[PDB]
From a paper:
We report the biochemical, structural, and functional characterization of the protein coded by gene PA4880 in the P. aeruginosa PAO1 genome. Our structural work shows that the product of gene PA4880 is a protein that adopts the Dps subunit fold, which oligomerizes into a 12-mer quaternary structure. Unlike Dps, however, the ferroxidase di-iron centers and iron coordinating ligands are buried within each subunit, in a manner identical to that observed in the ferroxidase center of P. aeruginosa bacterioferritin. The ferroxidase centers in Pa DpsL catalyze the oxidation of Fe2+ utilizing O2 or H2O2 as oxidant, and the resultant Fe3+ is compartmentalized in the interior cavity.
The initial protein purification strategy, which was carried out in the absence of MgSO4, resulted in a very low protein yield containing only a small proportion of dodecamer Pa DpsL. Fractions containing 12-mer were concentrated in 50 mM phosphate buffer pH 6.2 for crystallization screens. Prismatic crystals were obtained from the Proplex screen condition D5 (8% (w/v) PEG 6,000, 100 mM MES pH 6.0, 100 mM MgCl2). Structure solution and refinement produced a DpsL model (1.3 Å resolution) containing one molecule in the asymmetric unit, with electron density defining residues Ala31 to Ala171. The N-terminal residues Met1 to Ser30 could not be modeled due to conformational disorder. The Pa DpsL structure adopts a 4-helix bundle comprised of α1 (R33-G63), α2 (S67-Q93), α4 (L119-L144), and α5 (R152-L176), and the short helix α3 (L105-R108) in the middle of the long loop connecting α2 and α4. The anomalous scattering difference map revealed the presence of two large electron density peaks (36.7 σ and 34.6 σ), which were assigned as Fe ions based on the electron density maps and coordination distances. The Fe ions form a dinuclear center buried in the middle of the 4-helix bundle, where they are coordinated by the side chains of residues E47, E80, H83, E130, E162, H165, and two water molecules. The structure of the dinuclear center, which is contained within the four-helix bundle, is different from the typical architecture of dinuclear iron centers in Dps, but nearly identical to the ferroxidase center of P. aeruginosa bacterioferritin (BfrB). Taken together, the structural features of Pa DpsL, which revealed a classic Dps fold harboring a bacterioferritin-type ferroxidase center, indicate that the product of gene PA4880 is a Dps-like protein (Pa DpsL).
Author numbering:
A (entry chain A), B (entry chain A): 31 to 177
Amino acid sequence: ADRQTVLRLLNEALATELVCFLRYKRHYFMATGLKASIAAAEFLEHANQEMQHADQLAERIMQLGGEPDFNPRGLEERSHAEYVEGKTLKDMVTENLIAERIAIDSYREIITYLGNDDPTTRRIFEEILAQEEEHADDMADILDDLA
Amino acid sequence: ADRQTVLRLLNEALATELVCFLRYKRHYFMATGLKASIAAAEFLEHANQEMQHADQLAERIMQLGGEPDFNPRGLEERSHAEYVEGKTLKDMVTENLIAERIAIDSYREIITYLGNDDPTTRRIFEEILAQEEEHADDMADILDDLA
Ligand SMILES: [Fe+2]
Ligand SMILES: [Fe+2]
Ligand SMILES: [Fe+2]
Ligand SMILES: [Fe+2]
């Protein structure tokens, strides 16, 4: 694989995970204000899992001799997912489902781009992808009870 | 106290803690690349403590009927501390000491501004201030062994 291209894709994924962490933290706090207990619990669980994903990505960046970009200024422009506050609980759940589906689609594209060229990095994306699918299922379950 | 002014100061402190979290996470990963084990450990411990501070601040914002601003785009402009990468270990340690001293000075100013007008919020800042003093001592201890 091209080392620089893999490092850029890892840093884009890192930005995605950090944006999703911040968005889920926002939603957790707002959900506590609505007394939406299980939604809040899922938002916080998901936030901490996104930070675990960020950690795995940054560790791989270090292993490949790159530098992980945690600068908040450019995060949104490196991330495929958006930071969106929303107003209602339904808005927040919908925005998280949108973001998880974006992350899923982006990680599938990265896995295909990598092919057989960097198996270690590929497996990291495969593991994260599987957990984003669980995140999306979690959000869909809540969203269906709000429709 | 003026509720809106207290909410703004809480959101500025929240941004400060989030910037410091991101900067310490950057430094942790770079320090692992340098095999600077105890510096890395302190950077990560400090990062997770800054996120605990952020959580306490956001919880108080919710209690006062405000909204905690986790948007990464404007974080640096709301934060008194800066996100600074540095190049060497000494640079990173120095930047964290600078940032802790900034946070300490800003939190002392906030505590004086609050006076007796919002004791709950004041005590939150007092608790965080005490831990930032410990963070600064930790960084100074490392920095002196690098001088
Ligand atoms: Fe993730
Ligand atoms: Fe996710
Ligand atoms: Fe702090
Ligand atoms: Fe600190």
